[PDB]
Scaffold this active site. Structure first.
Site, PDB file in Angstrom:
ATOM      1  N   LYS A 159       5.058  -0.549  25.935  1.00  0.00           N
ATOM      2  CA  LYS A 159       4.652  -1.665  26.783  1.00  0.00           C
ATOM      3  C   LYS A 159       3.309  -2.228  26.336  1.00  0.00           C
ATOM      4  O   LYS A 159       3.140  -3.452  26.221  1.00  0.00           O
ATOM      5  CB  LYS A 159       4.627  -1.232  28.255  1.00  0.00           C
ATOM      6  CG  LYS A 159       3.913   0.045  28.544  1.00  0.00           C
ATOM      7  CD  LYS A 159       3.977   0.459  29.969  1.00  0.00           C
ATOM      8  CE  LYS A 159       3.069   1.638  30.175  1.00  0.00           C
ATOM      9  NZ  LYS A 159       3.038   2.113  31.549  1.00  0.00           N
ATOM     10  N   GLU A 185      -6.819   1.251  31.630  1.00  0.00           N
ATOM     11  CA  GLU A 185      -6.506   1.380  30.220  1.00  0.00           C
ATOM     12  C   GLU A 185      -7.415   2.422  29.577  1.00  0.00           C
ATOM     13  O   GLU A 185      -8.432   2.830  30.137  1.00  0.00           O
ATOM     14  CB  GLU A 185      -6.673   0.016  29.541  1.00  0.00           C
ATOM     15  CG  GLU A 185      -6.145  -0.094  28.132  1.00  0.00           C
ATOM     16  CD  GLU A 185      -6.134  -1.518  27.615  1.00  0.00           C
ATOM     17  OE1 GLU A 185      -6.491  -2.437  28.382  1.00  0.00           O
ATOM     18  OE2 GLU A 185      -5.776  -1.719  26.437  1.00  0.00           O
ATOM     19  N   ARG A 186      -7.029   2.861  28.386  1.00  0.00           N
ATOM     20  CA  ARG A 186      -7.909   3.672  27.563  1.00  0.00           C
ATOM     21  C   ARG A 186      -9.020   2.830  26.953  1.00  0.00           C
ATOM     22  O   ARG A 186      -8.840   1.656  26.629  1.00  0.00           O
ATOM     23  CB  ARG A 186      -7.134   4.344  26.454  1.00  0.00           C
ATOM     24  CG  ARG A 186      -6.143   5.337  26.933  1.00  0.00           C
ATOM     25  CD  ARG A 186      -5.375   5.920  25.793  1.00  0.00           C
ATOM     26  NE  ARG A 186      -4.417   6.911  26.241  1.00  0.00           N
ATOM     27  CZ  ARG A 186      -3.294   6.639  26.892  1.00  0.00           C
ATOM     28  NH1 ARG A 186      -2.956   5.398  27.185  1.00  0.00           N
ATOM     29  NH2 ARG A 186      -2.497   7.622  27.257  1.00  0.00           N
TER      30      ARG A 186
HETATM   31  N1  LIG Z   1       7.465  -1.356  18.028  1.00  0.00           N
HETATM   32  C1  LIG Z   1       7.315  -0.036  17.803  1.00  0.00           C
HETATM   33  N2  LIG Z   1       7.698   0.533  16.646  1.00  0.00           N
HETATM   34  C2  LIG Z   1       7.549   1.847  16.421  1.00  0.00           C
HETATM   35  N3  LIG Z   1       7.014   2.694  17.310  1.00  0.00           N
HETATM   36  C3  LIG Z   1       6.595   2.256  18.512  1.00  0.00           C
HETATM   37  C4  LIG Z   1       6.718   0.833  18.829  1.00  0.00           C
HETATM   38  N4  LIG Z   1       6.228   0.669  20.066  1.00  0.00           N
HETATM   39  C5  LIG Z   1       5.818   1.884  20.502  1.00  0.00           C
HETATM   40  N5  LIG Z   1       6.034   2.825  19.573  1.00  0.00           N
HETATM   41  C6  LIG Z   1       5.705   4.260  19.716  1.00  0.00           C
HETATM   42  O1  LIG Z   1       5.318   4.527  21.065  1.00  0.00           O
HETATM   43  C7  LIG Z   1       3.977   5.015  21.088  1.00  0.00           C
HETATM   44  C8  LIG Z   1       3.191   4.528  22.287  1.00  0.00           C
HETATM   45  O2  LIG Z   1       3.048   3.135  22.381  1.00  0.00           O
HETATM   46  P1  LIG Z   1       2.169   2.610  23.605  1.00  0.00           P
HETATM   47  O3  LIG Z   1       2.399   1.131  23.722  1.00  0.00           O
HETATM   48  O4  LIG Z   1       0.784   3.181  23.484  1.00  0.00           O
HETATM   49  O5  LIG Z   1       2.873   3.337  24.844  1.00  0.00           O
HETATM   50  P2  LIG Z   1       2.479   2.962  26.342  1.00  0.00           P
HETATM   51  O6  LIG Z   1       2.652   1.472  26.346  1.00  0.00           O
HETATM   52  O7  LIG Z   1       3.485   3.711  27.164  1.00  0.00           O
HETATM   53  O8  LIG Z   1       1.056   3.422  26.505  1.00  0.00           O
HETATM   54  C9  LIG Z   1       3.345   4.553  19.813  1.00  0.00           C
HETATM   55  O9  LIG Z   1       2.267   5.413  19.494  1.00  0.00           O
HETATM   56  C10 LIG Z   1       4.509   4.613  18.858  1.00  0.00           C
HETATM   57  O10 LIG Z   1       4.666   5.932  18.344  1.00  0.00           O
HETATM   58 MG   LIG Z   2      -0.388   1.992  26.997  1.00  0.00          MG
END
Ligand SMILES: Nc1ncnc2c1ncn2[C@@H]1O[C@H](COP(=O)(O)OP(=O)(O)O)[C@@H](O)[C@H]1O
Ligand SMILES: [Mg+2]
Ligand SMILES: Nc1ncnc2c1ncn2[C@@H]1O[C@H](COP(=O)(O)OP(=O)(O)OP(=O)(O)O)[C@@H](O)[C@H]1O
Ligand SMILES: Nc1ncnc2c1ncn2[C@@H]1O[C@H](COP(=O)(O)OP(=O)(O)OP(=O)(O)O)[C@@H](O)[C@H]1O
Ligand SMILES: [Mg+2]
Ligand SMILES: [Mg+2]
Lengths: 487, 170, 529, 52, 50, 140, 364
Positions: A159, A185-186
């Protein structure tokens, strides 16, 4: 002329109780404690009253080294926050204090933080589609300009990454302005976003910027992390009402705003509701969600992220966020673990402008046919797991393969995911996004293999990839032959 | 009197680096030099190529890392860690002088194989070594060749014909 | 000269906590500050302010000499926050979170500080080699990163962190003292004997020069268990501000949450979900947002954090667990179904990620980890199948399984010694051997150089005996013109000599004595390598 | 209290730590005389430093 | 027959866990309301005793 | 009513903030009585009362197809039937996505017209059989 | 000198409040009322202070026929209990009073029941396998001499029987003084154990006895069950420290120690944690566990049983108890229902000594 002063009664965590001899100020009024005693200006905000002499309050800064009976100053106004063109290309706190070391802010005017929602007459719903460049969204959840979006999902789904990609695609092409609100957020993601907006020259200090960034992060106390989204709306509603511009309002995330007040509700003495939430959650969220809405004057195309703890949608925080949106995008662990990103479940999410009349008819029919197909696809994993693929008609195996190809095809690499994917992102246009699903919908591409659809953009990229996989298969075939020739 | 430098956040950055390089050259143990990099970086003066090469000089020419001895000291590894801090972290890239300091140590250390890695890496980056060092590398190689020291001895001995957890040494 | 200021007398005491009765009215106490309680004319019991009340009473957390506390004792006030000694002089010591040393056989640092703001920290660029191939390849940990360690009881949560601490030592003795990463092991609510064994482990491998241990045992007061991880991060403050590096290991943070619950509930705070006060998220948030990779303006320092959270029945739905997954970047999920199922470390890759990725790990590891991600994503789809096409098995079904063997370790692995074992898999040199001999191979590949023994020495430099090629590999990378061909002309000879001399003899064993001997050999290879 | 603390600090029964020892860096002439044996002798030296 | 034998246990534990989750949420709320009752003070009760 | 599930959140908010005693899902006791104060005002009045009528179509949102929820349990206990929509059918091109077995009208025929009783009475005798056949037949 | 005197304030269960005019003694101080009024002796330990001139204190015997203005007497010390070889072959109460009707215990000194845990310097963990003769216990979860053991099992699974088997195998051929703490379990079992040992000459009364018995059973109020484990540890710590001798510590069981402290926390008015336990559970249990360690002076090889109500490990009491032990032995009911006994679940069990460094490589 003089501002009345109040003395503190008690301090329990972030909650403080203040005396006021003459009369208590309005609710949500700000209250400064001078930095002579605790080293920093400890601003505070009233949340409720207790008596004609007393009223308790929150603190967006940490109450440390704070005595009792300290004088508390009535500003006479709630938290005034700056608005203008000068707010652009700057990081701001809850109070509007700029935390980046770029210098002071020029401000001809300074609006408060809480305001009444737009009356029903002021609102305006115009059915107009937004092109994200993302391939799932442009079909099943065609985002409406001036509308509200929600990237529901647990931890580890993308997300935040989707927000980064949407910034990359939309905010550049957005001739208006943009606003980002970090809420729980972080503190690291703030650096990555600021450095990206600077490298992308969305934030061009020597030149002109078009992105406000507000940050109240996990490090901050609850009274800050609650009063961030309202700060970002002080920034955005100025650009909407006064400037008449179009605005983007990214939020990461709406759920931390909720639990920030949950962490205080026990101290306030409000009886907790079910799962551990405040009783006033729905009302409190509605007072914010309604501020996010287009009007006759302008349009805020908000995007929201939500944390679904334990991947439980039944949690009242997401469930109350359903009503307040137009595109309830949903992400799932099951699609993410399968290697498919963005990990969208097209069946669990559905938009508002997915109508026959608002959008093109081919778009609508192709989308609903894919939804209709993936339903049967679920019903057939439920069987293939038990019987086998041989126990299905050829006509049924066909839609199995097609749904299995649509599931992998609706994946897409992003420019932001270059680190993780190791591949360059692809921008997929809306028109190209229908002649490629519809082709796959009527068997126009069944000869093409499955993995050729995995992690690519349009249909033209596929045949490139499939031609490759044919070549890299012929290599192992003929190399097996030469291995047989050698030995 | 030079192109002003900037951090990743676009902030203006100091360049007055000389007063810190002198503290490197005046050092006597080559761990204090790294600390000079630290106290330099805290002052908004990030290191430049000249400073890192001063540190590699002080490393090569110093006797020990710290005043007391330390087990696991490798005069080469510190020098080759600065180059990772240079290329990757800081974006600066080394020069012929830097790899020169590096190769001198492998001559002093007698490790003739890692030298040839450095000899190849230079020219893959356009850098050219000094033949005074290339010939000394080959000299150490020929000496270790004739003497049986081409490899350590523990590799040039037969293995246990029978499988046994003790014989193999585990 | 120095007259202590008194604020009241001890009104009540409930175990670890107390309630003060103020002496005078115009006297005012601060919040979060330390107080002192004259338990005797000689000794003093430190404390901390947790509540203030309309009655003037003070809800107090006690931290030392609780048994000597009574009702009516004179109570004094420093008017300063809780602080501890800080500096390099503390390395090589076990230490009470109040700074007091625990025997065996000037400067002061604030315990609660604000975190590095959004401008005062650099993104993650550099790695932290935990020593395990899954965590160096597929779950790359970096510096200024905070990565959780989840798992059910007795799965390896403690050991991953200890092995990180033990991997860094060899490097730190070689590299300068600016790029060395020190360590802090915080034991909250643990057993005092576990702490002793950790001290002796680190002392064996000489990892105690670069480690301090913050002990808050189970018998210690809950307030001390509460402020232990803050003491650890408080030491990390100096190494941030002194431009150094440092590692944090918060043994169970759940045990730091039980303590906050104990405090808050006994001080008559309102409970919340799972009987916690409610603001236990902010607790770990304060603790963990202090991790950062600091800006070059601030020394380019760092502190990595490896928090640990116990899990019950492999659920990630408990309150504190979700509160921490929310915070931490990634997570290393350890599944008892895999620990019990043979493999150790029992990392479950489907549920363990890292939100930094390639940017943390190395140039030489980017190209291998990006291959292992593809390979494991493809093996994840097939490995459910009981292998039917024994000869028709896909190459992925081969390489993936051998890579799983390589994932099996006990202790940390040197960087040079890890890649060269994974490169063979991804490029298929280790495909003719069988699964069960994947580690003996590795052993010989790393500790018994075959071509040096059997005379097949055409490589000019590339041999695994020197152990100083790690730095050349790290800088140049394996996919480099000078290192690629020599690498292949080491591994293909290793494979041929293995397949001919060793593999051949192995498959010729029929007796039970010899096969049990060969059995135990491979388990030893799985441990030491 | 100063006297009590000072008495607790000292450990007469214990042996004070020796100066730190550097890496052996054995010469090539030693190794040329004894190719395969120096490893065994260093291991025995550790054994004797611990036990004997 | 076997699947039914599993289904009754699944339905049974589902409802067991459902009811226990309900009871638990109640006791959370009652714990908080009770703690607040302890937080609230007693008044004075001033009246003629003579 | 779009919808009552939010109305109950509001009654919860009020009652808890005014320190009324809580209950299941943090609701008070008389929240069943809340909707009974309302829905019983729906009626088909008598010819002494103008023969007017007030019909009700109260909406209640479920979550993960739960009907064991407190409010859903209550409104089902109150209402003179129910309609149950399903997302698994909404996605499969079946719109309105009823589930006819769970959907009930205790007012079966007295509402229907002369032309409607025969037709719908045949459709019951068609769909009750269509399910016994459609459920057992394969996918193929 | 003159003895302090205090007067009762209120009574809610076994918990009592006392008004001390001058000042209040420290926590854990014992407080006695003469048996003239209540009919029996009644010792009452302080556990917390409410205000100055007041102390809240729990009773050991029952509060029956106790009034609100009774003279209470400050003993001036904690609950002291006897130690030495005179404690051998005798059954003891929470108060240290012998109940086996034999004769006056010839103690020389009495030690308190509450005690600071050993220092980190004193601990010395030597890993040595403890051959029980039980077959699952050896392979899967091999016990450790001087370590701790946990028999985690519901009602009717067989943990008590495992304890009896260990006694017949380990304790008799131990050569060290054993201790048996009964904590909220069947009084029947204590009778059977006293006879099982008095026949095996372990409790030879005309000779040398190698055993100590302590029994606070389920009939006793929570004030006793909450403070009987400590009373056994005093008896064992004397043999650990003074005698410098190996000992065994069979606890049956600590879940009722936890229950008793919970039943008290309700009476004290402390806000409860989740499922209804006291907030201070982890602390109260750790102050007990960490006393059970093997120092340089000696060693305590404990066998703690644990109860799991409703067959739930997520119950906070066992869940906390796992982290304090060296060998978890998780029993099951479905295994017992299948006729297997001992009803061990090896997948859930675990051990610390299960490494090749301690046990030989093949066994691992
Ligand atoms: N488009 C993408 N392609 C590959 N891996 C993805 C993608 N989006 C998310 N990820 C995986 O999901 C992990 C977390 O994404 P993040 O957006 O930080 O999660 P959240 O939104 O739940 O905090 C990433 O570190 C990656 O490993
Ligand atoms: Mg996030
Ligand atoms: N990679 C490994 N190889 C061999 N043994 C391992 C490995 N990882 C863990 N173990 C073993 O598992 C056991 C427990 O490890 P650890 O101490 O990390 O457990 P834990 O996660 O701390 O659980 P708890 O905190 O409940 O003790 C030890 O015996 C340890 O040696
Ligand atoms: N090894 C065994 N062989 C046969 N029966 C056994 C064995 N172990 C236990 N049992 C049976 O299980 C039942 C209970 O044994 P035990 O007295 O240990 O119960 P428990 O585990 O103490 O549970 P509780 O404390 O609730 O009684 C008895 O009927 C006993 O005979
Ligand atoms: Mg552990
Ligand atoms: Mg029993």
């Amino acid at each position: 002329d003089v501002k009345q002063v109040g003395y503190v009664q008690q301090i329990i965590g972030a909650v403080v109780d203040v005396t006021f001899t003459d009369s208590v100020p309005p609710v949500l009024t700000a209250l400064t404690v001078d930095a002579k005693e605790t080293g920093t200006l400890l601003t505070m905000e009233i949340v409720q009253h207790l008596d004609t002499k007393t009223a308790r309050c929150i603190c967006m800064s940490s109450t440390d080294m704070l005595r009792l009976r300290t004088p508390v100053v009535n500003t006479g106004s709630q938290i005034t926050v700056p608005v203008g063109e000068a707010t652009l290309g700057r990081i701001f706190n809850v109070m509007g204090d700029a935390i980046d070391q770029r210098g002071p802010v020029k401000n001809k005017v300074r609006w408060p933080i809480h305001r009444k929602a737009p009356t029903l007459a002021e609102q305006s719903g115009k059915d107009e589609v937004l092109v994200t460049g993302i391939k799932v969204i442009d079909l099943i959840l065609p985002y409406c300009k001036g509308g509200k979006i929600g990237l529901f999902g647990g931890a580890g789904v993308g997300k935040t990454v989707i927000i980064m990609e949407l910034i990359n695609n939309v905010a550049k092409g957005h001739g208006g302005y943009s606003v980002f609100a970090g809420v729980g957020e972080r503190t690291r993601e703030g650096t990555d976003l600021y450095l990206e907006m600077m490298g992308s020259k969305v934030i061009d200090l020597q030149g002109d910027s078009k992105c406000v960034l507000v940050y109240g992060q996990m490090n901050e106390p609850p009274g800050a992390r609650a009063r961030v989204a309202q700060t970002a709306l002080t920034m955005a509603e100025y650009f909407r009402d006064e400037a008449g511009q179009d605005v983007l309002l990214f939020v990461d995330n709406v759920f931390r705003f909720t639990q920030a007040n949950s962490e205080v509700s026990a101290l306030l003495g409000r009886i907790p509701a079910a799962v551990g939430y405040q009783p006033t959650l729905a009302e409190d969220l509605g007072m914010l969600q309604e501020r996010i809405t287009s009007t006759v004057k302008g349009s805020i195309t908000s995007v929201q992220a939500v944390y679904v703890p334990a991947d439980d949608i039944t949690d009242p925080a997401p469930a109350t966020t359903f009503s307040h949106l137009d595109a309830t995008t949903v992400l799932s662990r099951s699609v993410a673990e399968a290697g498919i990103y963005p990990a969208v479940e097209p069946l669990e999410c559905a938009s508002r402008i997915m109508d026959p009349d608002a959008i093109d008819v081919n778009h609508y029919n192709v989308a609903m046919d894919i939804v209709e197909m993936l339903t049967k696809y679920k019903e057939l994993q439920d069987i293939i797991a038990v019987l086998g693929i041989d126990e299905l008609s050829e006509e049924d195996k066909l839609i199995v393969d097609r749904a299995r190809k649509v599931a992998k095809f609706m994946s897409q690499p992003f420019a932001v995911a270059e680190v993780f994917t190791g591949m360059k992102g692809y921008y997929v246009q809306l028109e190209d996004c229908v002649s490629d699903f519809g082709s796959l919908l009527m068997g126009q591409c069944d000869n093409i293999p499955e993995m050729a659809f995995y992690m690519v953009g349009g249909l033209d990229s596929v045949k490139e990839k499939a031609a490759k996989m044919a070549a890299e298969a012929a290599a192992m075939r003929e190399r097996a032959r030469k291995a047989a020739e050698a030995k | 009197a030079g192109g002003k430098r900037y951090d990743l956040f676009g902030y203006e950055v100091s360049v007055a680096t000389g007063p810190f390089i002198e503290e490197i050259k005046k050092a006597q143990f080559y761990d204090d030099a790294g600390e000079v990099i630290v106290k330099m970086n805290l002052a908004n003066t990030p290191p430049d190529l000249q400073t890192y090469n001063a540190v590699l000089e002080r490393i090569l020419n110093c006797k020990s890392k710290r005043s007391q001895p330390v087990k696991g000291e490798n005069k080469f590894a510190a020098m080759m860690d600065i180059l990772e801090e240079m290329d990757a972290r800081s974006g600066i890239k080394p020069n012929a002088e830097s790899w020169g300091y590096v190769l001198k140590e492998l001559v002093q250390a007698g490790d003739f194989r890692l030298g040839w890695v450095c000899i190849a890496g230079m020219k893959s980056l356009g850098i050219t070594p000094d033949q005074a060092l290339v010939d000394a590398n080959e000299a150490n190689a020929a000496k270790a060749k004739a003497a049986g020291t081409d490899f350590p001895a523990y590799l040039k001995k037969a293995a246990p014909e029978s499988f046994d957890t003790k014989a193999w040494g585990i | 000269l120095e007259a202590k200021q008194k604020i009241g007398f001890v009104h009540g005491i409930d175990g670890t906590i107390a309630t003060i009765a103020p002496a005078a009215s115009k006297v005012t106490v601060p919040y979060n500050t330390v107080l002192e309680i004259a338990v005797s004319a000689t000794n003093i019991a430190n404390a901390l302010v947790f509540n203030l009340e309309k009655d003037g009473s003070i809800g107090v957390i006690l931290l030392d000499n609780i048994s000597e506390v009574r009702s009516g004792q004179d109570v004094y006030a420093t008017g300063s926050l809780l602080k501890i000694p800080v500096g390099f002089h503390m390395l090589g010591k076990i230490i009470n979170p109040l700074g007091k040393e625990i025997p065996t056989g000037t400067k002061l640092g604030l315990v609660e500080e604000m975190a590095p703001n959004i401008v005062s920290r650099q993104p993650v660029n550099y790695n932290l080699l935990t020593g395990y191939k899954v965590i160096d390849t597929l779950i790359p940990v970096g510096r200024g990163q905070r990565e959780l360690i989840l798992g059910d009881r007795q799965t390896g949560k403690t050991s991953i962190a200890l092995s990180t601490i033990l991997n860094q030592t060899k490097v730190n003795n070689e590299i300068l003292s600016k790029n060395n990463v020190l360590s802090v092991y915080v034991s909250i609510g643990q057993r005092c004997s576990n702490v002793a064994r950790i001290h002796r482990l680190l002392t064996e491998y000489d990892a105690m020069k670069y480690c301090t241990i913050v002990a808050a045992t189970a018998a210690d007061p809950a307030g001390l268990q509460y402020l232990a991880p803050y003491a650890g991060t408080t030491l990390g403050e100096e190494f941030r501000n002194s431009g150094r590096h440092i590692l944090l290991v918060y043994d169970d943070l759940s045990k730091q949450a039980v303590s906050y619950r104990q405090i808050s509930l006994l001080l008559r705070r309102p409970p919340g979900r799972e009987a916690y006060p409610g603001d236990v998220f902010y607790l770990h948030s304060r603790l963990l947002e202090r991790s950062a990779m600091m800006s070059p303006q601030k020394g380019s320092g760092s502190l990595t954090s490896l928090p640990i959270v116990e899990t019950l029945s492999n659920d990630v739905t408990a309150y504190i667990v979700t509160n921490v997954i929310s915070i931490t970047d990634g997570q290393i999920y350890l599944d008892a179904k895999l620990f019990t199922g043979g493999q150790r470390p029992a990392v479950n890759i489907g549920l363990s990620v890292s939100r930094v990725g390639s940017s943390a790990q190395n140039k030489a590891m980017k190209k291998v980890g990006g291959a292992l991600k593809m390979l494991m994503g493809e093996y994840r789809k097939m490995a459910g199948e009981q292998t039917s096409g024994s000869q028709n098995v896909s190459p992925v079904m081969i390489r993936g399984a051998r890579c799983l063997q390589l994932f099996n370790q006990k202790g940390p692995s040197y960087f040079m010694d890890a890649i060269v074992a994974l490169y063979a898999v991804t490029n298929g040199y280790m495909d003719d051997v069988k699964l069960q001999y994947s580690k003996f191979y590795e052993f010989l590949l790393l500790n018994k150089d075959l071509p040096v023994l059997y005379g097949q020495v055409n490589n000019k430099y590339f041999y695994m005996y020197n152990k100083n090629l790690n730095y050349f590999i790290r800088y140049f990378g394996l996919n480099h013109e000078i290192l690629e061909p020599e690498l292949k002309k080491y591994i293909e000879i290793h494979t041929n000599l293995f397949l001919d001399n060793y593999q051949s003899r192995m498959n010729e064993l029929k007796s039970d004595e010899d096969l049990v001997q060969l059995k135990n050999l491979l388990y030893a290879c799985k441990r030491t390598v | 209290a100063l006297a009590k603390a000072s008495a607790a600090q000292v450990d007469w029964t214990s042996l004070p730590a020796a100066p730190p020892r550097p890496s052996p860096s054995a010469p090539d002439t030693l190794i040329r005389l004894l190719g395969s044996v120096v490893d065994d002798l260093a291991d025995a030296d550790k054994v004797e430093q611990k036990y004997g | 027959g076997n699947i039914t034998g599993l289904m009754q246990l699944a339905d049974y534990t589902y409802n067991k866990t459902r009811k226990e989750l309900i009871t638990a949420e109640l006791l959370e709320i009652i714990g908080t309301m009770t703690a607040m009752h302890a937080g609230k003070k007693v008044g004075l009760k001033k009246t003629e005793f003579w």
